[PDB]
Amino acid sequence: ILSTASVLAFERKLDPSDALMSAGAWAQRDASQEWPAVTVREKSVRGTISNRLKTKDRDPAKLDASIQSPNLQTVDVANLPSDADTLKVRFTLRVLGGAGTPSACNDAAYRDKLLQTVATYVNDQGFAELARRYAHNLANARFLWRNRVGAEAVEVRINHIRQGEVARAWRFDALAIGLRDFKADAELDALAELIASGLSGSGHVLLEVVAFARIGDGQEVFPSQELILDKGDKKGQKSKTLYSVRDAAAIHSQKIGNALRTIDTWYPDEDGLGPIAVEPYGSVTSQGKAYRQPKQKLDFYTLLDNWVLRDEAPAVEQQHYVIANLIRGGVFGEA
Template sequence: MAKKENIIASVLAFEKKLVPSDGYFYGTNWNNRAEQTALKLIPKSVRGTISNRLKPAVAGDPMKLNAEVEKANLQTVDACALGEHQDTLKVGFTLKVLGGVENPSACNNETFLKSYHAVAQKYIENYGFTELAKRYALNIANARFLWRNRVGAEKIDVVVTVNDQEAVTFNAFDYPLHGFDHADGQVQNLANQIASALKGELPYLLIKVEAYALVGKGQEVYPSEELVLDKGKGEKSKILYQVNDVAAMHSQKLGNALRTIDTWYPEFDEKKTAIAIEPYGAVTNLGKAYRTPKDKKDFFTLFDKYALGEALENAEQEHYVMAVLVRGGVFGQSSKD
């Protein structure tokens, strides 16, 4: 009998099933949202102070420290802010939900494909993506996708339009960021439609999302920051994202927020914080992987068992595995191992 490690396809890929657009930034007023203007980036040239950690020899010598502090820290940076008479940020994007998780976009092993397809069909029959869909819906309702723009906002309304249906408005602060047990009728209705699309029962699901955050007149807002790999002697030390002169947020950043539903990783009881669905539970700003092969809680360890028909410990592990497949990616096993 062939070893299980040789049954896993060496070419295996899944297309993502939650497909957000970029998020566009507009300025408006809470009590008059009809008037909206696209927000543009504002270049600023500033003279900063030396604030980085210095070498002990410099920090311990007052003369050297004074000499270092006297140096001008000149910077040109991008910024973005509401207009003088605007108090509300609007962020708008669309989210397309696709079905077909049971069918990889690429797979070169027919035996594995048949086994995985049967397992995926069984998951759909047993759970119907209802748990995952509820969590995605809650992350739309709670405006997690606003990231830093959510902090300090006085009020946040999230207006959701599904296909051509009537728009529904959520008060973002009614829904917690790290708990997924509370789902009222509006959230459940949205979740049901997302689940139907993931199961393939709906041929088309497009969700239009518009978030309005009351942050204060003229306040700074925060589009995505561009990662510039080779800054060299570039003009700016911070470059923000824009599309056709409109400040914007990366679709990848929106997608990361929507899939921040993993409360099943080993340390959740201690952290009480949901993390994004990732194969190794990676949280880059903490420099930590919460799902390691050593603990056998990572995606690949669980997927290799699950896809070949072995039972996992509980439903939570099944939800996690399927959520990674909804995320999409390349998961083949190298034939050189």
């Protein structure tokens, strides 16, 4: 009857590293190899009562008493130097290949059927649309999450590191290439073919991606935020902790991977939001909602079950979504 496998673990393609933040001045970014790193430091914040009150704390005496005892805490803060207006963020990306092959599979017949399904996809249309959209999210600085919202000029440089050396160099204007449209461009097409060769398994590709953002002198930059155990004293609370590896502000690799993953424009709801990350049940953390609900028969699992088990191939857009979710990887199958 060819039921689905209980264990369907997949390994991820498109492996990014931690993205390190350094700082410097515009028009000296061609010699940015020795730019000083952005350092996460401590500052003190004093806050008032600015949250909603539950109809019992709205008493004027209680509210004023809460004012007389403000919350004192220290926060991890990352800022550019006062003589530097450009933020440099550098990471390396490795594209593996072999997306349709699971890392663990209970059923051999289901494994073979899934391999035939993915091979039929690649033979019909290869990793060309998906790689083009991944190259688009590389060209624009979407991995530069909050450091791009107010940057005046953003430039992304992507190199192909073959034997430890730049075999091919790309330079992009990350603001001309927006965060909404997946258009066509010759350099975007070349990077798309490179990522396609990586995803198909034709050759080994390693991409060094460097983004420069002209934000301003001494302006705040935004690395990834860590978890606080919340055990110390209230005055030295450490309400905000920033991610660094060796005294250098950094962005988590999975955040970079999530920003590169933002290629899903095929979800049933409208195009007002634009692309979203290719996740099962189309989850967006900021909106707190799930596009591609399982009730709407457009999530990853129902589409994969219809495509593989019972040969109901969906539309080519949903096929792109399914293959991008297999590239994304995850612990599929019933636990």
